PDB file of C-alpha atoms and ligand atoms in Angstrom:
ATOM      1  CA  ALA A   3      61.044 -91.902 -19.641  1.00  0.00           C
ATOM      2  CA  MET A   4      63.149 -93.634 -16.996  1.00  0.00           C
ATOM      3  CA  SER A   5      61.493 -93.967 -13.625  1.00  0.00           C
ATOM      4  CA  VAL A   6      63.079 -94.475 -10.205  1.00  0.00           C
ATOM      5  CA  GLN A   7      60.614 -96.788  -8.421  1.00  0.00           C
ATOM      6  CA  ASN A   8      58.109 -95.849 -11.127  1.00  0.00           C
ATOM      7  CA  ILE A   9      58.066 -92.100 -10.404  1.00  0.00           C
ATOM      8  CA  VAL A  10      58.872 -89.479 -13.045  1.00  0.00           C
ATOM      9  CA  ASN A  11      58.744 -85.700 -12.761  1.00  0.00           C
ATOM     10  CA  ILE A  12      56.819 -84.214 -15.659  1.00  0.00           C
ATOM     11  CA  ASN A  13      58.088 -81.359 -17.733  1.00  0.00           C
ATOM     12  CA  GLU A  14      57.745 -80.444 -21.420  1.00  0.00           C
ATOM     13  CA  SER A  15      60.654 -82.834 -22.143  1.00  0.00           C
ATOM     14  CA  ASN A  16      58.662 -85.929 -21.051  1.00  0.00           C
ATOM     15  CA  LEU A  17      54.931 -85.063 -21.155  1.00  0.00           C
ATOM     16  CA  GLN A  18      54.325 -86.634 -24.549  1.00  0.00           C
ATOM     17  CA  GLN A  19      56.211 -89.869 -23.718  1.00  0.00           C
ATOM     18  CA  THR A  20      54.341 -90.282 -20.444  1.00  0.00           C
ATOM     19  CA  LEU A  21      50.925 -89.687 -22.078  1.00  0.00           C
ATOM     20  CA  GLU A  22      51.914 -92.362 -24.620  1.00  0.00           C
ATOM     21  CA  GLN A  23      53.109 -94.733 -21.846  1.00  0.00           C
ATOM     22  CA  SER A  24      49.572 -94.374 -20.462  1.00  0.00           C
ATOM     23  CA  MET A  25      48.287 -96.362 -23.490  1.00  0.00           C
ATOM     24  CA  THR A  26      50.020 -99.446 -22.087  1.00  0.00           C
ATOM     25  CA  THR A  27      50.587 -98.718 -18.383  1.00  0.00           C
ATOM     26  CA  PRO A  28      48.152 -96.608 -16.354  1.00  0.00           C
ATOM     27  CA  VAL A  29      49.594 -93.298 -15.241  1.00  0.00           C
ATOM     28  CA  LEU A  30      48.730 -91.600 -12.011  1.00  0.00           C
ATOM     29  CA  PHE A  31      49.176 -87.856 -12.562  1.00  0.00           C
ATOM     30  CA  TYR A  32      49.709 -85.946  -9.348  1.00  0.00           C
ATOM     31  CA  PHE A  33      49.353 -82.162  -9.519  1.00  0.00           C
ATOM     32  CA  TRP A  34      51.249 -80.944  -6.497  1.00  0.00           C
ATOM     33  CA  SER A  35      52.934 -77.880  -4.998  1.00  0.00           C
ATOM     34  CA  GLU A  36      55.712 -77.415  -2.436  1.00  0.00           C
ATOM     35  CA  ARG A  37      53.414 -74.712  -0.873  1.00  0.00           C
ATOM     36  CA  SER A  38      50.452 -77.014  -0.291  1.00  0.00           C
ATOM     37  CA  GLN A  39      50.194 -78.463   3.186  1.00  0.00           C
ATOM     38  CA  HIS A  40      47.919 -81.167   1.719  1.00  0.00           C
ATOM     39  CA  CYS A  41      50.625 -82.129  -0.770  1.00  0.00           C
ATOM     40  CA  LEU A  42      52.882 -82.679   2.226  1.00  0.00           C
ATOM     41  CA  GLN A  43      50.492 -85.475   3.390  1.00  0.00           C
ATOM     42  CA  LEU A  44      49.775 -86.952  -0.047  1.00  0.00           C
ATOM     43  CA  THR A  45      53.292 -87.050  -1.499  1.00  0.00           C
ATOM     44  CA  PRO A  46      54.773 -89.740   0.885  1.00  0.00           C
ATOM     45  CA  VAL A  47      51.688 -91.859   0.509  1.00  0.00           C
ATOM     46  CA  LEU A  48      51.721 -91.771  -3.305  1.00  0.00           C
ATOM     47  CA  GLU A  49      55.420 -92.456  -3.635  1.00  0.00           C
ATOM     48  CA  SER A  50      55.359 -95.580  -1.499  1.00  0.00           C
ATOM     49  CA  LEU A  51      52.316 -96.958  -3.317  1.00  0.00           C
ATOM     50  CA  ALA A  52      54.446 -96.359  -6.488  1.00  0.00           C
ATOM     51  CA  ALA A  53      57.112 -98.596  -4.835  1.00  0.00           C
ATOM     52  CA  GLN A  54      54.702-101.284  -3.621  1.00  0.00           C
ATOM     53  CA  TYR A  55      53.037-101.583  -7.004  1.00  0.00           C
ATOM     54  CA  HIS A  56      56.191-102.631  -8.868  1.00  0.00           C
ATOM     55  CA  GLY A  57      55.483-100.776 -12.155  1.00  0.00           C
ATOM     56  CA  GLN A  58      51.820-101.719 -12.365  1.00  0.00           C
ATOM     57  CA  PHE A  59      51.277 -97.897 -12.549  1.00  0.00           C
ATOM     58  CA  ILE A  60      53.663 -94.917 -13.077  1.00  0.00           C
ATOM     59  CA  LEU A  61      53.417 -91.901 -10.786  1.00  0.00           C
ATOM     60  CA  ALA A  62      53.719 -88.682 -12.813  1.00  0.00           C
ATOM     61  CA  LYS A  63      54.408 -85.776 -10.530  1.00  0.00           C
ATOM     62  CA  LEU A  64      53.586 -82.405 -12.085  1.00  0.00           C
ATOM     63  CA  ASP A  65      54.961 -79.485 -10.003  1.00  0.00           C
ATOM     64  CA  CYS A  66      52.288 -76.828 -10.585  1.00  0.00           C
ATOM     65  CA  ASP A  67      54.612 -73.886  -9.662  1.00  0.00           C
ATOM     66  CA  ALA A  68      57.482 -75.013 -11.894  1.00  0.00           C
ATOM     67  CA  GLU A  69      55.167 -76.132 -14.682  1.00  0.00           C
ATOM     68  CA  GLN A  70      52.346 -73.660 -14.718  1.00  0.00           C
ATOM     69  CA  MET A  71      51.447 -73.900 -18.400  1.00  0.00           C
ATOM     70  CA  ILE A  72      51.460 -77.716 -18.563  1.00  0.00           C
ATOM     71  CA  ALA A  73      49.103 -77.564 -15.547  1.00  0.00           C
ATOM     72  CA  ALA A  74      46.670 -75.065 -17.184  1.00  0.00           C
ATOM     73  CA  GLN A  75      46.354 -77.618 -20.062  1.00  0.00           C
ATOM     74  CA  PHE A  76      44.870 -80.244 -17.752  1.00  0.00           C
ATOM     75  CA  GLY A  77      42.216 -78.017 -16.268  1.00  0.00           C
ATOM     76  CA  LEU A  78      43.074 -78.086 -12.573  1.00  0.00           C
ATOM     77  CA  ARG A  79      40.599 -76.759 -10.037  1.00  0.00           C
ATOM     78  CA  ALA A  80      42.639 -77.380  -6.919  1.00  0.00           C
ATOM     79  CA  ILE A  81      46.057 -78.487  -5.775  1.00  0.00           C
ATOM     80  CA  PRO A  82      46.406 -81.316  -5.139  1.00  0.00           C
ATOM     81  CA  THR A  83      44.634 -83.247  -7.805  1.00  0.00           C
ATOM     82  CA  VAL A  84      45.389 -86.865  -8.613  1.00  0.00           C
ATOM     83  CA  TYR A  85      44.064 -88.240 -11.920  1.00  0.00           C
ATOM     84  CA  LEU A  86      44.388 -91.747 -13.250  1.00  0.00           C
ATOM     85  CA  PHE A  87      45.241 -91.798 -16.955  1.00  0.00           C
ATOM     86  CA  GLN A  88      44.589 -94.614 -19.382  1.00  0.00           C
ATOM     87  CA  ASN A  89      44.793 -94.487 -23.196  1.00  0.00           C
ATOM     88  CA  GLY A  90      45.942 -90.857 -23.004  1.00  0.00           C
ATOM     89  CA  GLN A  91      42.556 -90.331 -21.328  1.00  0.00           C
ATOM     90  CA  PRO A  92      41.637 -89.491 -17.707  1.00  0.00           C
ATOM     91  CA  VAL A  93      39.660 -92.331 -16.148  1.00  0.00           C
ATOM     92  CA  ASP A  94      39.120 -91.271 -12.527  1.00  0.00           C
ATOM     93  CA  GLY A  95      40.808 -89.175  -9.852  1.00  0.00           C
ATOM     94  CA  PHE A  96      40.311 -86.911  -6.913  1.00  0.00           C
ATOM     95  CA  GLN A  97      41.064 -83.548  -5.520  1.00  0.00           C
ATOM     96  CA  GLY A  98      42.457 -82.839  -2.116  1.00  0.00           C
ATOM     97  CA  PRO A  99      43.911 -85.129   0.564  1.00  0.00           C
ATOM     98  CA  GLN A 100      42.802 -88.818   0.649  1.00  0.00           C
ATOM     99  CA  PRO A 101      43.715 -91.805   2.813  1.00  0.00           C
ATOM    100  CA  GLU A 102      45.767 -94.604   1.356  1.00  0.00           C
ATOM    101  CA  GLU A 103      42.576 -96.706   1.165  1.00  0.00           C
ATOM    102  CA  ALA A 104      40.695 -94.559  -1.373  1.00  0.00           C
ATOM    103  CA  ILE A 105      43.899 -94.394  -3.494  1.00  0.00           C
ATOM    104  CA  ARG A 106      44.287 -98.206  -3.649  1.00  0.00           C
ATOM    105  CA  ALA A 107      40.576 -98.455  -4.375  1.00  0.00           C
ATOM    106  CA  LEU A 108      41.080 -96.118  -7.322  1.00  0.00           C
ATOM    107  CA  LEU A 109      44.169 -98.017  -8.434  1.00  0.00           C
ATOM    108  CA  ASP A 110      42.965-101.637  -7.997  1.00  0.00           C
ATOM    109  CA  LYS A 111      39.739-100.886  -9.980  1.00  0.00           C
ATOM    110  CA  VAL A 112      41.797-100.413 -13.127  1.00  0.00           C
ATOM    111  CA  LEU A 113      44.941-102.448 -12.511  1.00  0.00           C
ATOM    112  CA  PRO A 114      45.132-106.140 -13.679  1.00  0.00           C
ATOM    113  CA  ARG A 115      44.086-108.819 -11.160  1.00  0.00           C
ATOM    114  CA  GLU A 116      46.579-111.306  -9.765  1.00  0.00           C
ATOM    115  CA  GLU A 117      45.198-114.017 -12.102  1.00  0.00           C
ATOM    116  CA  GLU A 118      45.704-111.845 -15.185  1.00  0.00           C
ATOM    117  CA  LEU A 119      49.319-111.126 -14.331  1.00  0.00           C
ATOM    118  CA  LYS A 120      49.859-114.832 -13.621  1.00  0.00           C
ATOM    119  CA  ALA A 121      48.173-115.706 -16.957  1.00  0.00           C
ATOM    120  CA  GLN A 122      50.500-113.244 -18.664  1.00  0.00           C
ATOM    121  CA  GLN A 123      53.590-114.664 -16.958  1.00  0.00           C
ATOM    122  CA  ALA A 124      52.404-118.116 -18.066  1.00  0.00           C
ATOM    123  CA  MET A 125      51.781-116.972 -21.655  1.00  0.00           C
ATOM    124  CA  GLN A 126      55.399-115.718 -21.787  1.00  0.00           C
ATOM    125  CA  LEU A 127      56.732-119.014 -20.479  1.00  0.00           C
ATOM    126  CA  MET A 128      54.605-120.810 -23.141  1.00  0.00           C
ATOM    127  CA  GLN A 129      56.105-118.398 -25.627  1.00  0.00           C
ATOM    128  CA  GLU A 130      59.466-119.740 -24.447  1.00  0.00           C
ATOM    129  CA  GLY A 131      58.158-123.350 -24.726  1.00  0.00           C
ATOM    130  CA  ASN A 132      58.574-123.583 -20.920  1.00  0.00           C
ATOM    131  CA  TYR A 133      55.114-125.189 -20.640  1.00  0.00           C
ATOM    132  CA  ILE A 134      56.266-126.987 -17.552  1.00  0.00           C
ATOM    133  CA  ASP A 135      56.730-123.768 -15.564  1.00  0.00           C
ATOM    134  CA  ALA A 136      53.640-122.151 -17.138  1.00  0.00           C
ATOM    135  CA  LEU A 137      51.442-124.925 -15.659  1.00  0.00           C
ATOM    136  CA  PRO A 138      51.598-123.965 -11.966  1.00  0.00           C
ATOM    137  CA  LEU A 139      50.915-120.331 -12.872  1.00  0.00           C
ATOM    138  CA  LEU A 140      47.880-121.309 -14.988  1.00  0.00           C
ATOM    139  CA  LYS A 141      46.404-123.630 -12.248  1.00  0.00           C
ATOM    140  CA  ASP A 142      46.905-120.830  -9.750  1.00  0.00           C
ATOM    141  CA  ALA A 143      45.423-118.204 -12.081  1.00  0.00           C
ATOM    142  CA  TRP A 144      42.514-120.504 -12.988  1.00  0.00           C
ATOM    143  CA  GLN A 145      41.503-121.113  -9.353  1.00  0.00           C
ATOM    144  CA  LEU A 146      41.884-117.393  -8.519  1.00  0.00           C
ATOM    145  CA  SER A 147      39.706-116.423 -11.566  1.00  0.00           C
ATOM    146  CA  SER A 148      37.076-118.884 -10.383  1.00  0.00           C
ATOM    147  CA  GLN A 149      37.744-121.125 -13.364  1.00  0.00           C
ATOM    148  CA  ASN A 150      37.140-118.478 -15.983  1.00  0.00           C
ATOM    149  CA  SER A 151      37.009-119.543 -19.610  1.00  0.00           C
ATOM    150  CA  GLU A 152      39.950-117.597 -21.106  1.00  0.00           C
ATOM    151  CA  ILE A 153      42.344-118.908 -18.468  1.00  0.00           C
ATOM    152  CA  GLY A 154      40.743-122.294 -18.794  1.00  0.00           C
ATOM    153  CA  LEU A 155      41.704-122.460 -22.456  1.00  0.00           C
ATOM    154  CA  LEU A 156      45.309-121.579 -21.697  1.00  0.00           C
ATOM    155  CA  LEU A 157      45.453-124.145 -18.909  1.00  0.00           C
ATOM    156  CA  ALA A 158      44.076-126.817 -21.212  1.00  0.00           C
ATOM    157  CA  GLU A 159      46.521-125.806 -23.980  1.00  0.00           C
ATOM    158  CA  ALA A 160      49.424-126.155 -21.574  1.00  0.00           C
ATOM    159  CA  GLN A 161      48.247-129.567 -20.330  1.00  0.00           C
ATOM    160  CA  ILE A 162      47.970-130.733 -23.937  1.00  0.00           C
ATOM    161  CA  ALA A 163      51.505-129.729 -24.947  1.00  0.00           C
ATOM    162  CA  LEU A 164      52.616-131.586 -21.788  1.00  0.00           C
ATOM    163  CA  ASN A 165      50.748-134.779 -22.852  1.00  0.00           C
ATOM    164  CA  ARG A 166      48.238-134.460 -20.067  1.00  0.00           C
ATOM    165  CA  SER A 167      45.331-134.947 -22.370  1.00  0.00           C
ATOM    166  CA  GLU A 168      43.129-136.334 -19.541  1.00  0.00           C
ATOM    167  CA  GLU A 169      43.695-133.247 -17.431  1.00  0.00           C
ATOM    168  CA  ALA A 170      43.044-130.938 -20.414  1.00  0.00           C
ATOM    169  CA  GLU A 171      39.820-132.788 -21.147  1.00  0.00           C
ATOM    170  CA  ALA A 172      38.714-132.390 -17.559  1.00  0.00           C
ATOM    171  CA  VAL A 173      39.370-128.633 -17.836  1.00  0.00           C
ATOM    172  CA  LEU A 174      37.580-128.216 -21.163  1.00  0.00           C
ATOM    173  CA  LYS A 175      34.444-130.120 -19.924  1.00  0.00           C
ATOM    174  CA  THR A 176      34.260-127.245 -17.376  1.00  0.00           C
ATOM    175  CA  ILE A 177      33.765-124.514 -19.988  1.00  0.00           C
ATOM    176  CA  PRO A 178      30.175-123.045 -20.462  1.00  0.00           C
ATOM    177  CA  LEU A 179      28.616-124.126 -23.758  1.00  0.00           C
ATOM    178  CA  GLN A 180      28.380-120.521 -25.014  1.00  0.00           C
ATOM    179  CA  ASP A 181      32.189-120.148 -24.722  1.00  0.00           C
ATOM    180  CA  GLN A 182      32.832-123.282 -26.835  1.00  0.00           C
ATOM    181  CA  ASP A 183      33.948-121.118 -29.751  1.00  0.00           C
ATOM    182  CA  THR A 184      36.803-121.396 -32.258  1.00  0.00           C
ATOM    183  CA  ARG A 185      39.777-121.712 -29.901  1.00  0.00           C
ATOM    184  CA  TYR A 186      37.938-124.193 -27.734  1.00  0.00           C
ATOM    185  CA  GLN A 187      36.929-126.249 -30.785  1.00  0.00           C
ATOM    186  CA  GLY A 188      40.588-126.368 -31.971  1.00  0.00           C
ATOM    187  CA  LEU A 189      41.623-127.704 -28.533  1.00  0.00           C
ATOM    188  CA  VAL A 190      38.963-130.444 -28.546  1.00  0.00           C
ATOM    189  CA  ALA A 191      40.073-131.436 -32.067  1.00  0.00           C
ATOM    190  CA  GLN A 192      43.711-131.597 -31.011  1.00  0.00           C
ATOM    191  CA  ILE A 193      42.866-133.890 -28.192  1.00  0.00           C
ATOM    192  CA  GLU A 194      40.965-136.305 -30.414  1.00  0.00           C
ATOM    193  CA  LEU A 195      43.855-136.339 -32.872  1.00  0.00           C
ATOM    194  CA  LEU A 196      46.331-136.931 -29.976  1.00  0.00           C
ATOM    195  CA  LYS A 197      44.279-139.772 -28.649  1.00  0.00           C
ATOM    196  CA  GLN A 198      43.994-141.305 -32.074  1.00  0.00           C
ATOM    197  CA  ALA A 199      47.693-140.963 -32.711  1.00  0.00           C
ATOM    198  CA  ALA A 200      48.392-142.796 -29.387  1.00  0.00           C
ATOM    199  CA  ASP A 201      45.838-145.629 -30.065  1.00  0.00           C
ATOM    200  CA  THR A 202      48.259-147.950 -31.962  1.00  0.00           C
ATOM    201  CA  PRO A 203      47.337-151.225 -33.801  1.00  0.00           C
ATOM    202  CA  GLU A 204      49.680-153.156 -31.498  1.00  0.00           C
ATOM    203  CA  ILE A 205      48.259-151.502 -28.362  1.00  0.00           C
ATOM    204  CA  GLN A 206      44.705-152.208 -29.485  1.00  0.00           C
ATOM    205  CA  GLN A 207      45.415-155.892 -29.890  1.00  0.00           C
ATOM    206  CA  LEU A 208      47.385-156.206 -26.612  1.00  0.00           C
ATOM    207  CA  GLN A 209      44.629-154.237 -24.859  1.00  0.00           C
ATOM    208  CA  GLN A 210      41.875-156.777 -25.745  1.00  0.00           C
ATOM    209  CA  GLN A 211      44.143-159.692 -24.754  1.00  0.00           C
ATOM    210  CA  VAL A 212      44.474-158.156 -21.217  1.00  0.00           C
ATOM    211  CA  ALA A 213      40.773-157.259 -21.081  1.00  0.00           C
ATOM    212  CA  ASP A 214      40.131-161.000 -21.400  1.00  0.00           C
ATOM    213  CA  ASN A 215      43.200-162.286 -19.469  1.00  0.00           C
ATOM    214  CA  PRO A 216      43.326-159.853 -16.523  1.00  0.00           C
ATOM    215  CA  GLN A 217      46.025-161.950 -14.839  1.00  0.00           C
ATOM    216  CA  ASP A 218      48.726-162.624 -17.419  1.00  0.00           C
ATOM    217  CA  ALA A 219      51.573-160.430 -16.083  1.00  0.00           C
ATOM    218  CA  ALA A 220      53.658-160.879 -19.287  1.00  0.00           C
ATOM    219  CA  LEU A 221      50.742-159.726 -21.528  1.00  0.00           C
ATOM    220  CA  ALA A 222      50.180-156.703 -19.268  1.00  0.00           C
ATOM    221  CA  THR A 223      53.907-155.988 -19.386  1.00  0.00           C
ATOM    222  CA  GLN A 224      54.328-156.042 -23.247  1.00  0.00           C
ATOM    223  CA  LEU A 225      51.261-153.784 -23.406  1.00  0.00           C
ATOM    224  CA  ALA A 226      52.772-151.413 -20.795  1.00  0.00           C
ATOM    225  CA  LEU A 227      55.867-151.334 -23.023  1.00  0.00           C
ATOM    226  CA  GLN A 228      53.776-150.392 -26.098  1.00  0.00           C
ATOM    227  CA  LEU A 229      51.954-147.725 -24.065  1.00  0.00           C
ATOM    228  CA  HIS A 230      55.379-146.340 -23.141  1.00  0.00           C
ATOM    229  CA  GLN A 231      56.289-146.273 -26.853  1.00  0.00           C
ATOM    230  CA  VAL A 232      53.680-143.529 -27.425  1.00  0.00           C
ATOM    231  CA  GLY A 233      53.906-141.691 -24.116  1.00  0.00           C
ATOM    232  CA  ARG A 234      50.975-143.257 -22.336  1.00  0.00           C
ATOM    233  CA  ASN A 235      53.138-143.499 -19.329  1.00  0.00           C
ATOM    234  CA  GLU A 236      50.642-143.171 -16.542  1.00  0.00           C
ATOM    235  CA  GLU A 237      48.528-146.001 -17.871  1.00  0.00           C
ATOM    236  CA  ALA A 238      51.696-148.076 -18.396  1.00  0.00           C
ATOM    237  CA  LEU A 239      52.859-147.395 -14.836  1.00  0.00           C
ATOM    238  CA  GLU A 240      49.478-148.029 -13.066  1.00  0.00           C
ATOM    239  CA  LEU A 241      49.164-151.340 -14.878  1.00  0.00           C
ATOM    240  CA  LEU A 242      52.695-152.424 -14.122  1.00  0.00           C
ATOM    241  CA  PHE A 243      52.103-151.242 -10.510  1.00  0.00           C
ATOM    242  CA  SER A 244      48.839-153.241 -10.212  1.00  0.00           C
ATOM    243  CA  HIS A 245      50.756-156.425 -10.806  1.00  0.00           C
ATOM    244  CA  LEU A 246      53.759-155.529  -8.664  1.00  0.00           C
ATOM    245  CA  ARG A 247      51.323-155.086  -5.686  1.00  0.00           C
ATOM    246  CA  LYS A 248      50.563-158.817  -6.184  1.00  0.00           C
ATOM    247  CA  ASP A 249      53.966-160.282  -7.035  1.00  0.00           C
ATOM    248  CA  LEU A 250      57.307-158.484  -7.255  1.00  0.00           C
ATOM    249  CA  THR A 251      58.572-161.407  -9.459  1.00  0.00           C
ATOM    250  CA  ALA A 252      55.628-160.839 -11.904  1.00  0.00           C
ATOM    251  CA  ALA A 253      56.197-162.183 -15.436  1.00  0.00           C
ATOM    252  CA  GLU A 254      59.587-163.382 -14.200  1.00  0.00           C
ATOM    253  CA  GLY A 255      60.946-159.987 -13.148  1.00  0.00           C
ATOM    254  CA  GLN A 256      60.127-158.377 -16.524  1.00  0.00           C
ATOM    255  CA  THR A 257      57.334-156.345 -14.888  1.00  0.00           C
ATOM    256  CA  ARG A 258      59.789-154.794 -12.378  1.00  0.00           C
ATOM    257  CA  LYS A 259      62.506-154.233 -14.972  1.00  0.00           C
ATOM    258  CA  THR A 260      60.113-152.517 -17.398  1.00  0.00           C
ATOM    259  CA  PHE A 261      58.630-150.461 -14.537  1.00  0.00           C
ATOM    260  CA  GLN A 262      62.081-149.238 -13.549  1.00  0.00           C
ATOM    261  CA  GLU A 263      63.157-148.544 -17.118  1.00  0.00           C
ATOM    262  CA  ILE A 264      60.097-146.299 -17.621  1.00  0.00           C
ATOM    263  CA  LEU A 265      60.881-144.442 -14.409  1.00  0.00           C
ATOM    264  CA  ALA A 266      64.499-144.179 -15.588  1.00  0.00           C
ATOM    265  CA  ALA A 267      63.278-142.630 -18.884  1.00  0.00           C
ATOM    266  CA  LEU A 268      60.991-140.083 -17.181  1.00  0.00           C
ATOM    267  CA  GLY A 269      63.870-138.776 -14.974  1.00  0.00           C
ATOM    268  CA  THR A 270      64.115-136.998 -11.614  1.00  0.00           C
ATOM    269  CA  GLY A 271      62.047-134.035 -12.809  1.00  0.00           C
ATOM    270  CA  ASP A 272      58.797-135.891 -13.408  1.00  0.00           C
ATOM    271  CA  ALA A 273      56.017-135.596 -10.818  1.00  0.00           C
ATOM    272  CA  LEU A 274      54.614-138.854 -12.272  1.00  0.00           C
ATOM    273  CA  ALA A 275      57.843-140.783 -11.912  1.00  0.00           C
ATOM    274  CA  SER A 276      58.549-139.280  -8.517  1.00  0.00           C
ATOM    275  CA  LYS A 277      55.184-140.416  -7.200  1.00  0.00           C
ATOM    276  CA  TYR A 278      55.839-143.965  -8.455  1.00  0.00           C
ATOM    277  CA  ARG A 279      59.413-144.153  -7.177  1.00  0.00           C
ATOM    278  CA  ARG A 280      58.234-143.565  -3.647  1.00  0.00           C
ATOM    279  CA  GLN A 281      55.434-146.100  -3.954  1.00  0.00           C
ATOM    280  CA  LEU A 282      57.940-148.554  -5.322  1.00  0.00           C
ATOM    281  CA  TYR A 283      60.380-148.026  -2.447  1.00  0.00           C
ATOM    282  CA  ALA A 284      57.613-148.466   0.136  1.00  0.00           C
ATOM    283  CA  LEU A 285      56.415-151.600  -1.527  1.00  0.00           C
ATOM    284  CA  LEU A 286      59.888-153.183  -1.972  1.00  0.00           C
ATOM    285  CA  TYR A 287      61.261-152.479   1.443  1.00  0.00           C
TER     286      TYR A 287
HETATM  287 CA1   CA B   1      30.126-118.116 -28.045  1.00  0.00          CA
HETATM  288 CA1   CA B   2      57.118-151.009   3.122  1.00  0.00          CA
END
């Protein structure tokens, strides 16, 4: 049934739909009467909570004078009654006037928390491969949830698809041992595979040659270039930046040129690049 600000008036034409809606979205049934002075207080309050809650619950007004038989079916003892429905089943409710505060308390006890809504917005974005916009929702939701496991797993999954394996690892190390179940174990395996896939023969050999020659700018620069080949961009940038802090001519300007090519490749939309651009500017000028 179509709502206007998430209010529908119940009659025999829409009872069954609304009861069915209740399986997915909680429904606040409000048994009311034009003749009830108490309904005159309650009505305005319930309608504006129906506005302020943006579809998180539907208000189902049942006029008990116009719809006497539908009302007898619910088993009313007084008008007004307000009953929260979920799964076609009454959950909680009350009878008589109530301040806004008791109503919210009844509503918020059942409605999804901010972090759950955020997690669901993020899951949709991830559905649309928009991992990049899912990330801030998941960080937000994860903090709000006090770093709960379920959200944790989603946050790690997002960081992995974004090639932020280090960040994902840091999240997963957070998870209680008892929650290290199937999904978690798949994530840990992905990470190991990702790491292995980025640990190239050429990188391994250049690595050791810089471990033992921690001053050859040209060696560090070819390495940085290999790291870039496989998306290890942060390591490649920090290492090129280490040597630029010492000499801007490093390895005869190849350090600076490689540094700026990587930044070019990462584009304007990269937090990582944008960080390093500003450090570069401050260092050069
Ligand atoms: Ca378990
Ligand atoms: Ca400066």
